[PDB]
Design an enzyme around this catalytic site. Structure first.
Site, PDB file in Angstrom:
ATOM      1  N   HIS A   1      -8.102  -1.556   4.877  1.00 47.63           N
ATOM      2  CA  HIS A   1      -7.282  -0.503   5.486  1.00 47.63           C
ATOM      3  C   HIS A   1      -7.049   0.627   4.509  1.00 47.63           C
ATOM      4  O   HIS A   1      -7.082   1.811   4.873  1.00 47.63           O
ATOM      5  CB  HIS A   1      -5.949  -1.110   5.970  1.00 47.63           C
TER       6      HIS A   1
ATOM      7  N   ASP B   1       4.910   3.378   5.915  1.00 41.65           N
ATOM      8  CA  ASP B   1       5.486   2.128   6.420  1.00 41.65           C
ATOM      9  C   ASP B   1       5.624   1.069   5.348  1.00 41.65           C
ATOM     10  O   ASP B   1       6.094  -0.017   5.656  1.00 41.65           O
ATOM     11  CB  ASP B   1       4.686   1.576   7.590  1.00 41.65           C
TER      12      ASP B   1
ATOM     13  N   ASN C   1      -4.783   3.860  12.043  1.00 44.06           N
ATOM     14  CA  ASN C   1      -4.886   4.845  10.964  1.00 44.06           C
ATOM     15  C   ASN C   1      -5.937   4.332   9.992  1.00 44.06           C
ATOM     16  O   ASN C   1      -5.664   3.434   9.199  1.00 44.06           O
ATOM     17  CB  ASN C   1      -3.535   5.048  10.268  1.00 44.06           C
TER      18      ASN C   1
ATOM     19  N   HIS D   1       0.833  -1.196   0.000  1.00 50.96           N
ATOM     20  CA  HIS D   1       0.000   0.000   0.000  1.00 50.96           C
ATOM     21  C   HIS D   1       0.870   1.249   0.000  1.00 50.96           C
ATOM     22  O   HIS D   1       2.048   1.143   0.136  1.00 50.96           O
ATOM     23  CB  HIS D   1      -1.203   0.028   0.930  1.00 50.96           C
TER      24      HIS D   1
ATOM     25  N   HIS E   1       1.162   3.954   2.015  1.00 46.83           N
ATOM     26  CA  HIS E   1       1.613   4.635   3.226  1.00 46.83           C
ATOM     27  C   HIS E   1       3.120   4.474   3.453  1.00 46.83           C
ATOM     28  O   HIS E   1       3.791   3.584   2.907  1.00 46.83           O
ATOM     29  CB  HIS E   1       0.916   4.073   4.428  1.00 46.83           C
TER      30      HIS E   1
END
Ligand SMILES: C[C@H](CS)C(=O)Nc1cccc(-c2nn[nH]n2)c1
Ligand SMILES: [Zn+2]
Ligand SMILES: [Zn+2]
Length: 231
Positions: free
Chosen positions: A148, A87, A179, A83, A85
């Protein structure tokens, strides 16, 4: 024991052997005033290594490569971010500079561009619709639908029956939403059943943050998402 957040100073990475030729990488990073742990995957790909997700930042990702060289000694040649993001793509520039070919779906790469995050170099074709799966060396990449994030992928290692759920999957001790800024709280439980329907033989389930578990993490995650939907 699996390393926990208080054991890993920010800037350090731990490797954890899951099965032969399958490791998780564990790092820590600050987000909005607190520090959190984060998981990724490493899979032996013949004489090379396939990396699943950065270690959440450039400095952590450099530490990851150093730890891999020290403990495993095979080159990381390819990486997939699950994804957009930080991280998952934060550190892609370090990987690229070290010679790693970096990959993500086209939805992930555009969403990364927009948020000002680092952008994987290559696009993964064949994952544009929920339920889609493609082979990528020793792993399968699966798009379960939005959860998510709308672009979230999961990763299955057949050799070892390892399901890497990434941030679509919560660990057992998490009972509140993290989040969800980018989440689709309506589709999320549906995408989880899809994962459940596509990989019922899964032996180890790794969430994006925290302690690995079994397919019980899927059920548990759905509860948390719905609890948070009528909170
Ligand atoms: C950037 C990264 C993308 S998933 C992230 O947000 N990690 C993350 C991990 C664990 C908890 C939380 C959180 N947010 N609010 N309370 N807890 C956030
Ligand atoms: Zn995320
Ligand atoms: Zn995450």
């Amino acid at each position: 024991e699996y390393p926990t957040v208080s054991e890993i100073p920010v800037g350090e990475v731990r490797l954890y052997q899951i099965a032969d030729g399958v490791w998780s990488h564990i790092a820590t990073q600050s987000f909005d005033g607190a520090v959190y742990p984060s998981n990724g995957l490493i899979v032996r790909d013949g004489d090379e290594l396939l990396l699943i997700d950065t270690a959440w930042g450039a400095k952590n990702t450099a530490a990851l490569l150093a730890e891999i060289e020290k403990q495993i000694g095979l080159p990381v040649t390819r990486a997939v971010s699950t994804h957009f993001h930080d991280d998952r793509v934060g550190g892609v520039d370090v990987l690229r500079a070290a010679g790693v070919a970096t990959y993500a779906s086209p939805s992930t790469r555009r969403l990364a561009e927009v948020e000002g995050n680092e952008i994987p170099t290559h696009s993964l074709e064949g994952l544009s619709s929920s339920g889609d799966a493609v082979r990528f060396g020793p792993v399968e990449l699966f798009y379960p639908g939005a959860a998510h994030s709308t672009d979230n992928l999961v990763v299955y290692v057949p050799s070892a029956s390892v399901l890497y759920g990434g941030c679509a999957i919560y660990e057992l001790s998490r009972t509140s939403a993290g989040n969800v800024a980018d989440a689709d709280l309506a589709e999320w439980p549906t995408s989880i059943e899809r994962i459940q329907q596509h990989y019922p033989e899964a032996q180890f389930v790794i969430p994006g943050h925290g302690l690995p578990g079994g397919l019980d993490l899927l059920k548990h995650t759905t509860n948390v998402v719905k609890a948070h939907t009528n909170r």
